[PDB]
Amino acid sequence: GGILLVANPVIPDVSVLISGPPIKDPEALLRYALPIDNKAIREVQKPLEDITDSLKIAGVKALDSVERNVRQASRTLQQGKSIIVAGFAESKKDHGNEMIEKLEAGMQDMLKIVEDRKRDAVAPKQKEILKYVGGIEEDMVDGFPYEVPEEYRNMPLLKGRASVDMKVKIKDNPNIEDCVFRIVLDGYNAPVTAGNFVDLVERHFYDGMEIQRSDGFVVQTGDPEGPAEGFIDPSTEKTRTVPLEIMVTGEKTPFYGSTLEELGLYKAQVVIPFNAFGTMAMAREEFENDSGSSQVFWLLKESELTPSNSNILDGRYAVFGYVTDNEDFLADLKVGDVIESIQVVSGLENLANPSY
Known part of the structure; x- marks a missing residue:
């Protein structure tokens, strides 16, 4: 661990x-x-992470859990005005958007696993996308x-x-x-x-x-x-x-x-x-x-x-x-x-x- x-x-x-x-x-x-004090980004962050719990489920059912967490995170995201304005900060507001952008594409890639199974070779794409979340947040309150x-x-x-x-x-x-x-x-x-x-x-x-x-x-x-x-x-x-x-x-x-x-x-x-x-x-x-x-x-x-x-x-x-x-x-x-x-x-x- x-x-x-x-x-x-x-x-x-x-x-x-x-x-x-x-x-x-x-x-x-x-x-x-x-x-950082920004509930909006923590809400996008919480699922995305619970995705690892979703993988503790046996069978195709794990995927209809991560799909759930992804649509969740994705939705809460479209609310990028409190993430972007409210908290992004000085000199990082540009790289912050570079991060929001990659997060959205990664969320779409995670989705593309409508190819039920491919439960391995794309799931911890969860790591990739949470770095982008980390990046959103580090770019925030600086x-x-x-x-x-x-x-x-x-x-x-x-x-x-x-x-x-x-x-x-x-x-x-x-x-x-x-x-x-x-x-x-x-x-x-x-x-x-x-x-x-x-x-x-x-x-x-x-x-x-x-x-x-x-x-x-x-x-x-x-x-x-x-x-x-x-x-x-x-x-x-x-x-x-x-x-x-x-x-x-x-x-x-x-x-x-x-x-x-x-x-x-x-x-x-x-x-x-x-x-x-x-x-x-x-x-x-x-x-x-x-x-x-x-x-x-x-x-x-x-x-x-x-x-x-x-x-x-x-x-x-x-x-x-x-x-x-x-x-x-x-x-x-x-x-x-x-x-x-x-x-x-x-x-x-x-x-x-x-x-x-």
Whole structure:
């Protein structure tokens, strides 16, 4: 599946590569991380993506689902005035239309599969066309940085996006001696953590380093919402009884576990540098002492968040990088393998307050 770069500020310089089945599609993740406020283009974007669910259907029926998603996206598009005017921006309004144009032709190509079957050799044409959607959106709200920092206003900051090529030397393997991975870093949402990583790439901090690999768990913590659009008449006002209950029909009643996944815990590959252990024991307690029962000591848990965390020690990470190429060869990384080099490929200008 998808592939990730995670970090904990105040605890910097050790950044974690997490990859595996539970990790969502890199490109989709970046698209949703763009600091744009345009419901119209998100509406075109939502289907187009659900097309992948449509392919989870067996038989010709999958196609009468993607045809559904395409006509959906296509329709909502004809509304290119809120996409075009409302949000397109300065110097990109031209390439933006270059993108809208290609999206329309691609949607027509997707349609041309009235040739029921051809369910392979044209379906992920879905990739092609979503890039054009990504492009529409990146061309939209530009202007770089939606907001700004707190106290770290003097540490490196990635006031944008940047790309990096990571060339790894993979040992003892017939079929592959080495691979190059492309990672995009998201400074719109992870200014501090992305800033630090590129800053360290610059001082060649990752070249010739060896890695450790292993398994960990990802608290892909909790996600979707509620509201549906299009205002009509009156139906609500009052909190009512949410107090005395055990609440509604198919929505609540006491916990429920059985496998780690059922508790929101998904297994993923975890690759780091190869280091040591450093401690700083404190906080607010008095719930300690003794023995009698517990313990063995293993498997790290990773809470995934947007930089919305503060001070002192442990628990929690912010997501800042996304592996967008050769994401399938990460599974071939073992302890002992070498990061030969990590070189910025684009976006270096977005780096402010560089130190190196």
